[model samples]
Each structure stands twice: as structure tokens, then as C-alpha cells.
Target chain A: KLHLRVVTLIEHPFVFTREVDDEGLCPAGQLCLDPMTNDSSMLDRLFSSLHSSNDTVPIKFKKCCYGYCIDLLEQLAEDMNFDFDLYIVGDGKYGAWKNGHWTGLVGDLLSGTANMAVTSFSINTARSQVIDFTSPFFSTSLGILVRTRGTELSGIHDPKLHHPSQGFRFGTVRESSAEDYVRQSFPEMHEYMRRYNVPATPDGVQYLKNDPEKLDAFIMDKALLDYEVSIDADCKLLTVGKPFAIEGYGIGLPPNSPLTSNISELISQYKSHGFMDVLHDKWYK
Target chain B: KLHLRVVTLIEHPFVFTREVDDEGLCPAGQLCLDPMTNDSSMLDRLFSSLHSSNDTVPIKFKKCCYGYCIDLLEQLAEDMNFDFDLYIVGDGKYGAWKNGHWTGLVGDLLSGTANMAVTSFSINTARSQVIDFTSPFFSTSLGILVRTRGTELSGIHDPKLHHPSQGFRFGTVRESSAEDYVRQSFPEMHEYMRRYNVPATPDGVQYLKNDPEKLDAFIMDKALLDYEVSIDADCKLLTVGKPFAIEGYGIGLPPNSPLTSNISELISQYKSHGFMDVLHDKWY
Candidate 1:
């Protein structure tokens, strides 16, 4: 069966794929993948009507992401009758304007290497100016997350009270909106917080787990932090202080991809019917 | 259709009832009620299961509640099967031991006037020593709630900043555990803060909305305040400080009630099958 090409950057509850290995452990020629789509999209409904095969839809999701954001994608697949396969991006980036050129998931889409980039892509100004974003699927905000009750708020990273320990480290993803926020929100502390820059939020989580004494705190979107801390077995982290900024999550497509308008219209349909509520209940709450 | 008798005290999201004046506005003699129950408790679930007439459930929520506490109750009714009605408590107390006698919801349950009391009843030692509670339904803590963009955190109610406004007033339910919390947490300010007390959380919300100039802040379960601010149309409130004083909500029953053991078992069953999860999503 012919499949629609889909690309994803490894992010929890968005696109979590593992490669198939030998000895039947990871099924041969298969990528253990999770993809989100909807019924209202034209592709799926047209494909199903033409194919008339219950077993025809070639796309298969492995361990569906339980976030409401993923649920939106899942419904799209049901409503639109199309089949697709999810592939991981070779370069692990949410896509950034690196050296005056696009790279990462947005890079893949801009090059027509993939049909879609379905992840928790924040609908920010910089990205939207280049790539096309579907109507927002989830709403969240930025927050400060730290190891729960760890090190007892006696450091420079503390939101309420600060004693400022000399060796304390504050971590954030290198090129993420979070890093931008830290710079914009606290420009004077830029050099002081530079050393703790890590590759991903998960890496920061790993540092907190591996060397409990290493990092002081991390700042990121509240929803992502919830996914990281609630799923991780190693550390008990909580959101300290209040949410600071708004983040609307959306699906990414190439700048002129025809699917963009369809995706947006369908999302609003589900919201009105309360289908979105059920999906949200499944993932969040 | 048979119905179950439950008692509540005008706590939004947990229990809300309104009388219909127009013809066909609501069912005749129908309480237009929402209540939570445990198998041993008769809180929210049993009513939900019995009411499900569809393969798919209708998550028809009214106010989206204040937090997960109310969401869980809404889900329980959607998932569990049983029918019930709610009755408001006469004295509007959560029930306290005063002068060798019980008062409030605890009093209603103790007096056999209610089959169960199903608001956000905190499972404290004093109440547990007297009445019975089913498995805990919601977990929360105490916190201070204030207007989101108010006239700055100043005056007698301010925790950190000290702008010292001349006409600031702080309010809480007259005889609630919130009042007790204020007395215990800040004993020195208790007497000075006594005059600002109101009837319930909704009243606090009304004050914040109608006269933000008069009321500065209040203390209550983070869950109740969540309901007051999130559900009310007028007030936009947020928690100011870290949560203090742990709270676990449970259905209140008479000590010797036969339904106690059975209610506990069903809650666990729902928890295992993801019914409890659906409930958590609705409100929390």
C-alpha cells in the first residue's frame, strides 16, 4: 500500500519511534511509531471510500500517545481515510534558523522530504513566519520546574526566596524557546546561566537524576514539564511559582502545504462537538 | 425511578442546585442536583453509572468545576450507576465538634437527616473519630486566594509586601475549616481578621467581583478557591502562596452504616478500570 510520508522529531507524546531490530524483538522492516491524524481531513475519508478495505489503511500507530494533542491527530486519521508512516528526523532539532538557513523538522518539510511534522511544535512568531502551522491543538504556558523538594530553594534559581549558592546550575535546552525566554526574562544572568545549557529537556532531567547535586532548576513549557516529570521514574519534580507565558501547540506543515487549512478547520469542528474534551480527559486530567 | 438522599452545603462544582420557575424549564420536582457517592459512601460514581443511557458517556459538565476535585466527582457520576438527590445543610457548617456536640454536614449525617454528605469533606481526625469516611476521593492543601490583578498585595492581609492600604478587608466562610485554618496558621491576626467572615466561598467570590476595593484576600482549600475563581464569572483570582495543610476529601457516612465497606471496594474497582481517570480529567 502506498503511504503518505510523515516526519517527526523525537519528542514525548508526539512522535516516539523505535527501530525494528533482528530476532523479532522489534518487528522486521517496521518502525515502532505513533502518528496523529483526523476524520475531517479529506485524505482519509476519500481513501477509505475508494479502497473499501477495513484492513487497507497502511498506517499503524505503535503505542498511541495519550496526550490530548495526540488525540487530535488520532481523530484526523479516523476522519480522513489516509495511510502514512512516521520517520524520525536525522538531525534532532525542532527546527531553528541556524546560520541563516532552516534545519530540523521544518527543514524536512521545506525540502518535501516529508508530508507532515507532527510534534508539540509551539506556535511562535519565528517559526510561523517560515513554516505553516495548523490551528492550535493544545494550550499551555511557560513555568519553572525543579526536582521536588530537592535542595530546598536555597539557590539563585529560586523564584520566591534566594540565598544564591555559588555552585548551583540552571538548565534549559540550547536553542529552545525556553533558552530565549531565560535570556529575555533575565538578560543580566545570561553568562551565569550559560554553562548549564543542555541538548534537551530530557537531558536536563537525566542530569537531575544522575547527579542530584548538579543542577539547580529548569524552565520550560508547563505541559512538557508535566510529561517529563510525571513519566520519569527517576525524579520527583514539581512546578514552582506561577506560569509565566502562553504556549499554543500546533501541527507543522511545509509553508504552502494544502493540508494546513483542512487541518485547522477539522480541529475547530472537534472542539465544538466536545470530542476534544474527551481526548483531553484521556491525556491530561 | 427511585432516588438516593444526599446532603450538601452550596459548594460550587461539588454540589450546585437551582430552582426552576418557568414551565418545562426542568423536570418537575427534580432537584436539578449533582452529588458524589462511594459504594461504601454513595458520592458521585453510582449516580453516574445508573444514568448512562449511551454506549458513549456524555461529559456534559456545567461549570467545569474549580479543579480536579469537582472533575472527579462529575466523572464518577458519568461512570458509576445509581440515582441520587442533594439536600442543602441547614446550618452550612462542614461539621465540627463544639461544646460536646457535632455541627454541620457531620451533624446532618449523625442525625440521620442525610444518607450521605458529599461536599469536599476534609478527612480530619476529629471528624473520622466520630463519623465514617469512604476511600479518599480528592487530595488538596490549604492556600491563600486573591484577585489576579488586584490593587497589589498590601495592607493587613498581605503576606510579603507592605503597601498598607487603609480600607482592605479579607473574608472567608463564617464557620468553615478555613476560619479554623486562619486561627491556627496565623493566630496573632485571627481576631483582627474575624470581622471579614462571609457565608460561603461563593460569597467570597461575589465580594471579590462586586467590590474588589473592599476585600483583599481569603484562605480556603486550594480546590474550593479554584472553584470560586475559575467558575465565577465576575472574579479572576489566583493562589498567592505555597499550599499548606494537607487535605483529603472523602464521602461522609454514619459510623455504623452498612454501605461503608461496599463503597470502598467500588472506588478501587473504578480506579483500576480507568473510570477514575476519566473523572480526574473532567475537573482537575
Candidate 2:
């Protein structure tokens, strides 16, 4: 009975929970709004739209990786112009994210611990070896997570076009897009890093927030950072730098699930209707 | 009912009329190929698919502006390895393209006189003060044009960056995106041109091509000039410089037409199925 236990990594506005299955209207917790009417609707209609036991249905946004996920949920709260209730999942607030995906969390979902994932996602070719992905909503996976400050190379074509080397290490997720990017683009500076490999996306967030000074800057999905700034507890994280290569952020579901069609249909609808553009305008300022 | 008397520019792979009411599949002219089939029914189906349409549909090309539309179209045709008729449309082979409309043509169908337009095109605001644009596709407009070989002002810190010496005219279309971009970004240059107008996308191409000696380099959409290198009649035409602003590329429909919906629908379909990615892969 594929009840579709959707697993999400809450970064904030991008993935929040609603008492009902909120689709277009708002993030979770905060009831969905009607784009047409600009009014909030009852949760029952929203949840029943997908979870109707009478026929084939979905349990959309079924599970979350907690922490960062809560942050994202709160963000959706703000987008809907309302406060949020909590359905927080995962480890507690003190837990810091380490570098990269944990085999357990991802494996559990793959082995049906969770049904699908609706978090700010990074597309990993290695992960694709295990899990499939929908078409990417964001353009690239790897980008520099610079602070508001500039890059070491931003303004340095001096006497001979060589840059000074006084700065310390840069941050990145182990085996994630940003890390892959650094390996490919910044091969010379690959060795220096303050490793923080959290099992999933939220743990990385937890780690970053807990030890801000230790990070030169941790590279991650722009969508995740964006989700936080809009809805999460720490909604002010800025993702600074040029996005390199395209990243596919998909609703990660268990292999061989029927929800694949539903997700694909939504992606198709989003791509066709300029919804991605709208989603961008909605989240990323 | 609007008969949609649209004017389509003919490029070998983009838009070509092989016969009356029948579009040609191969613009350079006909293609002959063998059908791959182990069974007669399959072979018959293949032949039927190939020859059934009175006029073949364009192998589904994303339009390229000005000159390279054909190059992109041809590439699409060749890549598909399938045979089909296609028509290319645009402002002109060489003329003003901005906003999403065209205003430059010397001869042929809409090139000289045809009114309404429908095809892969660019909109000229000069023309737009006379026409209309649909919506933008991409977002990189107003880029600097540099000399790939001959060097003058290399970066932003060259004397040439200020302005060309007096009496020399940097020419372009009267009104275009590049014109607006340059005028807006570099009003100093416009006042320096003594005309306060930058070149059109095509004019920027020409300034790089025919009049390099007379004119200092100009600015344009980075994509437009880059496209020239790939498909321009004289690809040696220009060296596109650093991108300035991200502008969108869209279709230009006459003031009002039902086809706008059709075009938008196609664009939507392209978005939904990653066809834009397909088109981007082909051209850029």
C-alpha cells in the first residue's frame, strides 16, 4: 500500500509541512492560499485532494530531515503571510550537519524508510547510481558559497595577474555538487578544508549555524539557502557566488514508486507554465 | 478570420518553400535516404511517415536570430538524422532586430515589403514604435563588442574606453536593444557619438564586419554576436565581449494575433519537456 511517505529536508520555504497537503498555495503548517482568490483555504480540501483513500492518491511531502526542514517550513509561513505550527522531524537543534549524505538516511528512504524527498536538493551523479532524479529546477549544483564578502580572485589581476596567498580554507560538502566543483575547478586548492559531513542536508545546516566561525563558507544548494532565508529559523543565510553547471532538484521517492508519475507531471507542468520562473520570483530575491 | 499572412525568412534548414503550399525539408535542397526496416510493414510505415505530409514540418528548430538561425536549424536537422521540411523566420538576414521585432531587410518576401511576421525573429523597438514583441527566452543583452584579433582598449581601463576620437561615428540602428542598452549604460558614449544612439544587434555585427576600420567597436547582446561566430554569413564579423545585462529573447507578433497563444503554447511545451534545453544545446 504505497502510502507515499514523502521525506523532505526542511530548509524553510521550499519544504514545510501543512496539516493538509498544500500544493500551490503555501508552505506546510500554514494552510495553502489560492493564487487566484488570495485567500487561505481549509486544510481538508488540500489534503484530501491527494490523500483520498477512495482512489489512487499521493501523500505529498510525507517526511522531512528535520532541523533545516523546519527552517524552510517557517519560511513558507512567511510567504503565506502567516505563522506556522510545527511537525518537526529528525534530530534536535544541537545536531550539526557533517559533510555529504549519510548512507543510513538516504538508504532508509531508498529502502522505504521515507517515501519521497521534497527538500532543497543537490543532484549527485554518484547518488544517481542509487536513486533517480526528476529534471532539475535550479540551473546548477556546484557554486561558491561566499559570504557577502568577495572571492579571493574577484579583483586580482595585479602586476602579473597572480593572486596573493594569505587566506585559509574554503568550505564544501563532501561528495556534493560544490565539492565536486571545487575538485574540478579548484584542483590546486583541494586539500584545504574544514570537513563537516552531515548525513543529510539539514545536518549540514545545523553544523553551519553552530560553528559559523569555523567555515570559510560551506557550499550547498542555492535553493536550500534560499528556502531558509524565506521561512526557516535562521532565514538570513546568503548563498554568494556564480552557480556552475546545472543541478537537478527532484522529489526523491523510493525506487519503483507510482508517485514518480505524479512528480513528473508536476515537473512538466512547472516547466511548461513558467512556474519555475514564478517559483524563483517567489523565493529568491 | 486572420489568415496569418506571416513572412518567414528562408535559410537552408530553417524555412524553405520547396513547392507551392509545400515546404522543403532540405533547404540546400532534397535529401535521399534508405529506410531501416526488417519487415515490409515497418518499411511501409517509415515511408508513409517520411512522405505523407503535403509539406514537411520543420524538424522542430529553435530559431536563431539574424544570420545563424539557419546554422542552428541545419545543425538540428543533421542531428535528428530524420528528414523533414522546415522554414526559418526572422527580422532580416541583415538588419535591425530588437525587443522581438525586425526592421532590416533588403529583398525577398518580408525582407523588402511583407507586413506581418511569424517565424524565429528579433523585435526592433524602432519597428516596435511600429510593432510588438512576444516575451523573452534568454536573459543576456547589452554586452561589449571586442576585436578578437586587433586589439584596442582591452579592458575597462583603456583610453579607448572613454570614447573614440572626435569625428569618428560608431553607427548602429536608430532603435534597438543594443541601442537602448548602450544609450542607458553609456550615455557618455551616446553624447560622444553626437547622435546618442548605439547600434542595433545586426548593426553591431556589421560594425564588427564591414566598417571596423571606420568605426570603433560597439556593444550588443553577447548572445547575438556570439551566435554570429557560429552562423553569421561573415562569422568573422565580430568578437562579443563581456556580458552587460541579462535580456530575454522572445518572439514578435504583429500588434494582435491568435498565433501569440500558439507561440506561447509552443514555448510552454518547450519549457515543460526540456526542449529549451534541447534548443540551447543546439545553438548556444
Candidate 3:
């Protein structure tokens, strides 16, 4: 009977939000839609609205979310014997420190807005300092997104790409792990990319698809990039170059949370029992 | 300047003890010899001797031990800024529940005989219940060791090998993970293996190597079996079939030990930085 608030972000093949049916319910096979806005711009207004209404005024809209992450979360809830209220993360940003405060899902956990955050959340050193992560459920590396071309593709380490004469541009989603990697390991490239970074993954994809060719390459998590390229109708996009900066995706929790060990044990079991493989094939294959 | 008492058991390519020179010292570039006997039978006597002597009587003989596990222990000690007294476990077993209490390295940790244990210790559900383990440094699986022959080798799961008509015998080192696996997953096989099981890894290897073929196949950790097969001078041993029962080898610590997190973090860092690959290549 333990009820907890859970937060998630919209990431392709991981978490997807869809419009609910006319009966104030999702389709037959889907769970009930949580009433929450997905717009990052409306995040501050949503919080203020919640405070002012104080549970009196019910939000009008409804949307059902289901994907890889949602399925895993549902299983975890059943196995752990807990009821949870799942909602889209405010601001839609993977938490990053800016001006001395955390934002997005990371901020929600630390501020006790949610007990858990699940999505394609990457585990990194900086984030690990502030919050705990369960053992990784998925492993991936950074990939370079580009338009297919005749010539062989070069990687992030290609000196020609960084040369002053070549106008070749590349950038990733702002406030993401890819950006953090560029900022830490390649400061010059990070500086050059400041003007080109997109606000979200969809925006980055659009930049690559634009008529003017706004980006020569889009850098992001390889798994997400692969999913995008596989579903591209035009068949123009390609994930070029070798993957780099290998890491894993884990569920996020507050620092020293009691759930860390139990969740980690479950994740380990899932891995050893090949349940993770089943989930991967169900979603990716 | 923290000092710890560490216990280890001899597991090939992991911990090896060598005879000391006439000067009662190990050769150059080797660690100092620890004055303790490696004989499992003398283990109880060694403990009683220590208690009776009370630091007054000097123990005789010395042997230097160094191998993959020793090197890792040295590095951990240096990085963690601690001094340690390394010695062999009182009992040669890998630690298992024999009666009402634990035995071997596991018991050493629980009874406060040692602060840490570094060997080819496997991480499993039962062991994990009594002691914590650092993140695994090496991943491996169960292997079937057999003498090479002209015909293709079959695996543990082959029904022909398990049938009553065929008297082909196979067993593993007692008090080990492989034994636990067989007992749990293949109860009939375990019953048949009761008469064939050896007390230690070397005995199991010898059984497979015996000229009359006392055993048909030996089941144990794949990594250990691989090392044994690689160094066989006769080149007659082979590890056949696909590996199964995948597991990892982790350093052993007392339950809820303070060092578990720190050591696990270090092990994880070593894995990500490719230091583990370096060690693997150097030893294997």
C-alpha cells in the first residue's frame, strides 16, 4: 500500500506519451493516462498552477505513456509491492547543475518531488555525486549522427573537423551527457558548439534534417541515435564513426536512498536471468 | 598507516607460494616470506602453535607467495594507504557451510581472523549472504576439463554422458561453486558425483590427467581450467563445450564491511580504465 511519486522524461523507445481516447482512458492494453503537460516551457506555470488550485481544479488534458521504461517501471512496482503516481518530468531536462541548483528529474528527486526517476538516464560521475543510481540496465556509447554520404566517415577525433578552414559543424542536445563530455574532454569543441546546440533531441534531429544543413553531425547517446536512424523514413540519416565514451543507463534515486541496494539487486537479477535481453529485443529488435 | 590482517588461499595463477633462499628471504623483486605452512593437515596445528608460542617462539621456515591475486592485493594496499600482514588461510577450503559454522576463508572473515580475503573467490548467492563482495574483477563461467581425444567432445548437458549405461565419471572440487551448482541444478548428477568429487582443484586436475583415466571430465571455474590447460607440458588437456553458469570472481569482505564500497568503486574504476585487461594479459 506504499504510494510514491515517480517522474519520467519523454525519450524515444524509452518513454513515449500519446493522446488518450474519448472515454477519459487509454486504449485497451494501456494504463490510465497521467494528467501532466509535456511542454518544458509550461513547467514553471504548471507548478504554480498546482499550488494555486491545491487539488481543487483537476487538469483538463490526459495522455497515456508507455514504452521500454514504462514497462520496466510497472514490473518493478509489482515486484516491489508499491503503488506509484507516474508523471512526466517538469522542464524535460536530464538534471544538470546550473547557477548552483539542479534542474529536471535530478532536481525532483533531491527536492522530494518524486521518489524515483526512470528513463534513459545516464550514470556519470557528477550526477553520481549528488544522487545514487541502480546498477545499469543498459550499456551504450556516444555516437555521431550524420547525413549519409559517399565518402567514409571520420570520428570526433578527426583533426580536419576541428580545423579553422572547415566549416563542418557538430553539436548535441544542450544540458546532456554528450555536452558534458564535449565540455570536459574537448573544451575547444565545446566552445565552438555553444551557438549550435539544440534544446532537445528532436530539435537536434531537425537540425540534421533541415534543408540548409544546420548541422554536419549530431552527437548523442548511440542507442537513441540508432533508434532515430532506424525509423527515419527518408533513409538519409546515418550514425557515422566509432562509438566513444562508453557508459550505462540507470534508474536515478536520491543520495543514500534506502532503495539503492534492493533495486540494484533486482537489476542484477534481471541481468543474470536474461530478462534484460528480453526487454531489449522487445523494444529494439 | 592502518594495518590489516589478510588471509588468502592458493589458487593457481591467483596465489602461488615459492620456497625462500638460504638467507631466509625471497629472491629480488619478490615479497618477504611469511613463516606459515601450506599443508592443510597442519592448519590446526599451526593455529595451536601460534596460541602456545605467544610471540615468544620463532616459527621455522619461510615461503614467498606472489601471483595475480597477490599483485592486486599489493596495488590495493598501496592505493588505499594501508599496511597488511598477508598469510595463508588456516584451512585450505574456499569457505563453505559444513555444519553449524562456516569453514575456510569465509570463516576467517566472520570469526575476525582476517580483515579481507583475496583469492579466486567466487561471488554467489549463498556466499553473498554471509559476506560482501567487491564488484567482480573477472567474469567467468563453469567449464568441463577433459583429456583431448580424436573424437569431438560432448558437454555436461549431453544425455549420453549422463545415462546409466555409460560409466563415464565426472566431478568437481568439493566445497566450491561448481559443486554447489551441480547439487542444485542436477541433483542426480550430484548423487553420481559423490564418489568422484576431489577435495581440491589440483586433485581434480590430476584425476583428469591420470593415465588410466580415473575421471572422464572435471568441472570447475573456466578461468582456472583454462590456465591449467594452457600450461600443460603434454598439451593433452582441453576445455570442451560452451561455457555455462556465468559468474564473477570478487574479493571477499566481512558482512557490511566499511571497505566494501571503497574497494568496489576502485574495482569499477579499474575495469573502466582497462587496467583489468592489462592484468588479464599479464597473468593469463
Q: Give the TM-score of candidate 2.
A: 0.37
TM-score of chain A of 2: 0.54
Off by over 4 Å in 1: A1-3, A19-74, A151-167, A232-235, A281-285, B1-284
lDDT score for residue B131 of model 1: 78
iRMSD for each candidate structure, in the order shown: 16.1, 13.5, 18.2
Query: Which candidate comes out best when scored by lDDT?
Result: 3
> What's the TM for model 1?
0.42
lDDT of 3: 0.74
Q: What does candidate 3 score on TM? A: 0.50
Give Cα distance to truth, residue B188, candidate 1, Å.
51
Q: Please state the error at residue B273 of candidate 3 in Å.
A: 27
- Model 3: residues >4 Å from true position, as ranges? A28-61, A150-153, A210-212, B1-284
- Which is better, 2 or 3, measured by DockQ? 2
Winning candidate number (TM-score)? 3
Using TM-score as the measure, what is the rank order of every candidate, best first?
3, 1, 2
Q: Which stretches of candidate 2 lie over 4 Å from their true place?
A: A16-105, A148-151, A154-167, A180-191, A196-213, A225-242, A256-258, B1-284
Q: Rank candidates, lDDT, best first.
A: 3, 1, 2
